[model samples]
Target chain A: PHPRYQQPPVPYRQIDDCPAKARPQHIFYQQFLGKDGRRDPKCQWEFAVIFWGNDPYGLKKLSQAFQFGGVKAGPVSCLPHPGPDQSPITYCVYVYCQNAATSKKVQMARLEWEASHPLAGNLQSSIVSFDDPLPLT
Target chain B: PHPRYQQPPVPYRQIDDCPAKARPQHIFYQQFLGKDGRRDPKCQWEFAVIFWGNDPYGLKKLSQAFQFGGVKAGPVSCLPHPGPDQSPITYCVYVYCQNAATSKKVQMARLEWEASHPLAGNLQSSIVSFDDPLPLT
Candidate 1:
């Protein structure tokens, strides 16, 4: 006989409302509440730098590039590209920055890197706030 | 006079391959290399639990819910949903786990939570490996 599935107690607070629209040069900020209905300090971030391309690992390296340039970068995340032609499996990578200045630095670094590295494939990048949803196609 | 944009030395290696396909009950693993072309110790992970719904914050709360249940959850990320009629701004949240066991535990927790809380806003979930690209639609 299969063991009865035990229902765990709900720990997180219910959230309503959709994500905020992404605006240029503005980062979204929200406190992620913990199980005790308090904000988790580690979850707050200012801006995120998004890269769109077919190479996931390349995007990862690009994220690291920002870090190497003294930008306080966070975890690198890859998501499906939301647009036409899903066969080749395009991906978008988000690299969370510590603040707006870091984000701008990343942007400038990306521009300079792209200018020099002509063989870096067709990589596109943009900046968005932390609360802005992904796949900004 | 405008200053010339100086191209910084490339720190990251170029990557060309697309992301691996996501298979059920399997996790993807790849080492992220540093500027010295060596693997970074902090970037490795096994599985990621993906939640799909219209609520970005709600999904974030759900991600925290998994963590409160003892799942070794990593940073939570929100991406745009890639389906028809993208009006309401649906989002997919990725909660990275340490290993398969933790991912399975998160799945179980998600099931129990959904079964008990019917008003949780039509939340759907699935498991994928670390290297699997987002939007497994």
Candidate 2:
């Protein structure tokens, strides 16, 4: 751990089991989008994302993992797992969008993620953390 | 039937079959949330309701109809169909956001309304008219 770092490890707890006082109750938000972008209110949107700071990893393996799927990041377009005591890894054998199959997949994925993470945040309310309500890949 | 409008009759058409020329292809929208109301975007909204003027109805009955439901039009208050054939109304029976049995009733009502009077507008597209795709009621 770097200097100025160092305290006892903060234990994580199951959100449902954790006391309400243990929950992180603070929130901070920042907005950005250039002058012209702000003109249309309807076109505006905001979202929460969890950011990961540096840590050691198999950089080579991570890069290759991103390339596992045949689709490559487009020009100027960069591209864009799971736990135990939970359901078995849901195999998304098939999927489609705006259709029954994709719709079903979306529903299942949402349910599973919500069940596993158990973090609560309202879309109308901006909050972010590791327990962010966003679906993780 | 009014005397001034007796020259011709216009029958409604299925949106899919209605020629492009018959549809109003132009659109204009204005946004406003002013005065004290502008402070809360969530609470303030302005919409251009397609108000039909000079229709026959009792003013007292209309007032009573608006008040028929107990929720009032308070401080900004409590507030807040049919066609036929060719699917006898494409019924959109969705129930949401309210109590269960009441929700069920709402869905049936929507289905019945859409069936009798069909208006077609897309949820993605901002188009609205008597041809709204609301599934009636």
Candidate 3:
């Protein structure tokens, strides 16, 4: 809830210089085989986020702060129930991030969260304050 | 919650048979570029979901729901953010369905809430009353 939270100064760097994995929406499809070979009801809803900023410095500092700054907020992860109704399912799971403004400011709001899990309902709400879209726990 | 929730004659019917986009994941990647000649974020996110689901019926249904659902949600009609940082952003998201114990039956929870927009918080919270993830909006 920082009305104007700023990341502590870093030497300053370019987002390009950052690790490749940090980039958001980098789609990675995995087949979870082993004891559980990609079974339905996936063991977990997996996702990752990427950021592109105005410059290296802003991008670098923001990245660092977000990584450790504890974004841990958004809404929960969500997934549509496998029903014919074609509606998003409500579940007991959830997630959230603290960077609402940052998300909104940078046009990263929905995109960031959606990119992570990509499902809808409780998947994203379990952690947040309980919006209609976010599912519950 | 459902004090005495009745099963939807067949809950699995609707979802297990959800309609998927003609350009499901594989196809999307094959074509990649959109009418704009740029990487279509919306298409990318949808492909990510379908790809993550192993192109299964449930996964397909969920992916379709998320994409169409998101459109109404606005730019919130998007996926996670891809900011510059560490690591290559290759990932997947999934939501599946299975027959669980009756004692823990989701039907009994009767937490039916329908809204295009996200509620108000992130997932992973104890106080979250609803059961779904909210997109950025």
Candidate 4:
């Protein structure tokens, strides 16, 4: 079984948000070694985030350039809403192992994304967040 | 008849190759406004690269973090050839655009990449070159 931690979970919190307009803004991300441990070196591990919506422009290249690891709580993520939209978007965190090999070394203990669950009024809000790393089962 | 310059051909030259081995190294990339011009403000454009080989670990997160417009030639790309012994790896580039937007206000004249093509025997050599931004013919 994968290792688990008992620390209070850092549930979905609104880290930042950009209005549904044609402008650019940065979003941050992070990965942990434990509940509140050292920042796991991004290139050293595997983490996947899926953005659901017409993230057409941003997410495509966003995911292409900065996986969850590279933009660790940094200003690496920027949203340039070129195409006007009515519905907003959210980033959901998921664990990905390249294979049995990658799982053996690093895994996700807990995963979360800010603004993960957006209510009607919160449409413009862009959220992101995370949990800890767990060794593969 | 379309503008051939905006439709510059994709050129291929053996940049560099590393014999299947285990050690981490940084790969660099850059995109331009045309054949010979200022560094394209990545945000105003889109650029992507894909690596060939059993790039299990790095490719996943690497692609997510460093796509041309986001990481901006940052040292976010690192390859850990842990899988050991196999054919060498190479990277290829691709481009895409958003809409029937303004060509007047913004258009890259050239594109370039640093340490893009790594020579097999000379891994330390960082090479970068450019070509005119081609218009879709």
| Per-candidate interface DockQ score | 0.04, 0.01, 0.07, 0.04
**iRMSD of prediction 3:** 14.7
Rank order (by lDDT, best first): 1, 3, 4, 2
Candidate 2 vs candidate 3: which has greater lDDT? 3
> Each model's fnat?
0.03, 0.00, 0.11, 0.00
Whole-model lDDT per candidate: 0.40, 0.17, 0.25, 0.23
Tens digits of per-residue lDDT, candidate 1, A15-100, equal 21221221111121121111212222443344555665666555544533332111223224443222222244444565545455
Window of ten residues with lowest summed lDDT in model 4 chain A: A1-10
List candidate 4 stretches off by more than 4 Å: A1-37, A41-43, A50-52, A56-137, B1-137
* Residue B94 displacement in candidate 3 (angstroms): 2.6
Candidates in order, TM-scores: namely 0.34, 0.16, 0.22, 0.20
Candidate 2 CAPRI assessment class: incorrect
Candidate closer to the true structure by lDDT (higher is better), 1 or 3 = 1
Q: Count of backbone clashes for each model?
A: 2, 15, 104, 38
**In model 1, where do residues sit more than 4 Å from their true spots?**
A1-137, B1-44, B68-77, B81-86, B131-137
Q: Give the per-residue lDDT of model 1 (tens digit) for B1-137.
A: 11111111111112222212211111111111112112223433445566666665565455333321112232234432222233555455665554555655666656655566587566666664533322322
Deviation in Å, model 2, residue B48 alpha carbon: 23
DockQ, candidate 2, vs. native dimer: 0.01
- The residue-by-residue lDDT of candidate 2 on B1-137, one tens digit each, is 53210010111224333234323310000011112111122321111111111211211111111110110000010000010111111111011111223323322332343354355222110101111111100
- What TM-score does candidate 4 reach? 0.20
